[PDB]
């Protein structure tokens, strides 16, 4: 699902 991959 993630849209900001470095966060999540």
């Amino acid at each position, epitope marked *: 699902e*993630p*849209q*900001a*991959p*470095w*966060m999540e």
Partner: antibody
Amino acid sequence: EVKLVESEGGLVQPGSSMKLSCTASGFTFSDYYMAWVRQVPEKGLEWVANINYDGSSTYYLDSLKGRFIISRDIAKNILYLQMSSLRCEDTATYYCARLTNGYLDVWGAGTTVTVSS
Amino acid sequence: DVVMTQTPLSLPVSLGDQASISCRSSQSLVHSNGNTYLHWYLQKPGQSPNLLIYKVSNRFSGVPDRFSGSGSGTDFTLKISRVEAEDLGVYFCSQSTHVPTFGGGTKLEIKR
């Protein structure tokens, strides 16, 4: 369409705040992450901030010491960038962008911010 | 702090020929989830950047099949076959596997 339109930026003195807005249209705003990126000539592109669907989680370029705040009015379809304690290195063209799966698939035309006395 | 290094800085290409642009990252861009968040953008003169290729090889809507992205790990290549004048401008690579950073850009120049 698709379309993001940044507000007028312009001239700001050091230490003062200024707030950019970005009007989004043509997609369920609370269905996309959004981001700000900036470009200085001679420096290239720098990711400034991003925000998830409802504003509960944000990311900021660390070196902005919490002086920038990204936020979104879902009711009005508007993305904001509040820039507090403005500094000279913040002079740049700021682009509003839509973020999907790590990439920026829609960009605004950009607005320039000049920090000078 | 992941550095994206692009070469060459400027690339002169005759119309109809192929242009090849290199983007290298200072750390692997393979995310723990298995995806590689390496993308390419084109900024034409007086315009904003626009997405060209996402996730190493996926063409964005409206991008001709002659733009092709490849690579893995830390080494990536954008290939433009049969170059047309309207391709000119600055190509940027971008990674978002890690704290997001951009390459310095490669300026495509058309020879005449």
